[model samples]
Target: STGSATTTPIDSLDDAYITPVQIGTPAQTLNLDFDTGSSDLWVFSSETTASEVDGQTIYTPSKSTTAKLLSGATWSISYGDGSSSSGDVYTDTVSVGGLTVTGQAVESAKKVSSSFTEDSTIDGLLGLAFSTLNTVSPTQQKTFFDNAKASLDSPVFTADLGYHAPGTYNFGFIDTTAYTGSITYTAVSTKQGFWEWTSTGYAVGSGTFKSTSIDGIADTGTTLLYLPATVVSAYWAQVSGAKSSSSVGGYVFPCSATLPSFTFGVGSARIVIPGDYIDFGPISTGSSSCFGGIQSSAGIGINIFGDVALKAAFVVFNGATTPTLGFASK
Candidate 1:
């Protein structure tokens, strides 16, 4: 079996991407964030408190004949950004695009943080990470991809995220026309339940490539690209009037400054992120200082190749026994 779905940025800043998902017997459609960094398919539901609910849609399990409570099962997940949610679990029929999975574990959120309540663009999150990372207690459940992979033509999924445009997520097959050039494959370490890999090195703008081994995870849930301080500083140095600001909480520069493109290596292949992609946006509503999309991963422990980098290329997550990641220029 195979499936294809459209994912669109929630806003011009490309803060997050949302995709439509069908759940239960009659098919209640809900827009969910397809997060690759975590592994718990959670949604706002009738169990959620009114105070925690905003304009987002809610999943009513009682209304679906196929929804069955996963008795004694519960889940709680907290993100690096401090957003959190806790919920009870339910097993129901879940579908994405043309693919369908019976008894897919669907977490029904009962409590959510303020950040989640205010974000009306997404109704919930559908985790695509390894099942080992699932937060369900008493009895862990498999991720949707894990349950459906056996029947898929191939054990792979592709992410083609666009910049200020709609992209696509395809399961079972790679769309040849979505990318350009040959794909470069690299080994992935799922020990920590992430699509972690090492990048050969990076170059700032037209500068020479630095021969260094940088390890990081490819996370579709995150909004920016985070790298070592050395690499981040080198990129910012190329732009005039750029400096790290404690007030703004990151690197900021004059909005008029010319930004440089960033290039990272995947084996012998190089993926270049356009200069405009690094100029995130203004620090404030009408401010002339712009925040950078590239930041230092100094204290974060792990570097993150987020949407900023992913949008520049097509990424393939291979779920083979020895899992690997493939990158191709678009």
Candidate 2:
């Protein structure tokens, strides 16, 4: 309710959802994944414990008496980051803030293995990307959005990503106070996975004065601020002894010194990531070390501006009122 206020509307036709949930009976409230990439809501059951799961806000199935899996309905999803989930499907009543919609089909996927699933500390991702990537209707049986469309309101889902700490992708209704007057939005083309956008460029360190062109995507699911090899090297180059830390697997300068200030360009906006936000946690996996939010993705294709970018600027998704993201240059 008061958590993520970013509500990105997804096309139920393109988006997905499931139906006929057992609300009166006892079962797990599978309030796991509310997908935007694919229109649907998914959750896991107490019966699913085969994988190494690490969701911050875990749902205890026994807490409620109105939850059950759609024995015949089930699906699995895999992310580009090498993470996947397979679980049963169920239709039930769902509520977001004050809006309580019913007869929504939710996915019950089990995360087999993933750095995000096992390492990160967050609840199951509420996908706010787009409905183009939805696995509903024909193939996976049901989806979360498909059912929600019939059970919910009109085309008005908004978002404000920075309400929480870094990497917290809050999705829901848009609050007018989040912005000033008028805004610019980029239209979303329903083609591929996770309502993706082509970035105009990126700016690293103080060199952000000049926009550096790069292929990018706006992702609410990701955590770090990833940059290309030449780009990251160029940006980090502004800092001395700022070599890539093999210990941390990302760019890590001497922990004692101040890091550089860099900005990334998305559409017509500029996102400046402070040096302090660079090193998030720590260098140690076992020990509490700064993970260094920014990383160099030399060989990886289609780099992403994850939550780091969202925290710095407000992003408009699925062409709510606008299609493009209006960024903060300061």
Consecutive 10-residue window with the lowest summed lDDT within model 1: 275-284
Candidate 2: regions farther than 4 A off: 1-40, 50-71, 114-123, 136-156, 163-173, 180-182, 245-248, 285-290, 319-330
Tens digit of per-residue lDDT, candidate 2, span 126-191: 454555555554444333333343333333344344423311222233445565544445444445
Give per-residue CA lDDT, model 1, range 1-330, as digits (tens): 999999999998899999999999889899999988999999999999999999999999999899999999999999988899999999999999899999999999999999999999899999988999999998999999999999999999999999999999999998999999999999999989999999999999999999899999999999999999999999999999999998888899998999889999999899999998888788879999999999999988899999999999999999988899999999
- Best prediction by TM-score: 1
Q: How accurate is candidate 1 locally (lDDT)?
A: 0.94
What value does the lDDT take at residue 15 in candidate 2?
Answer: 16
For candidate 2, what is the TM-score? Answer: 0.72
**Over 4 Å off in model 1, which ranges?**
none
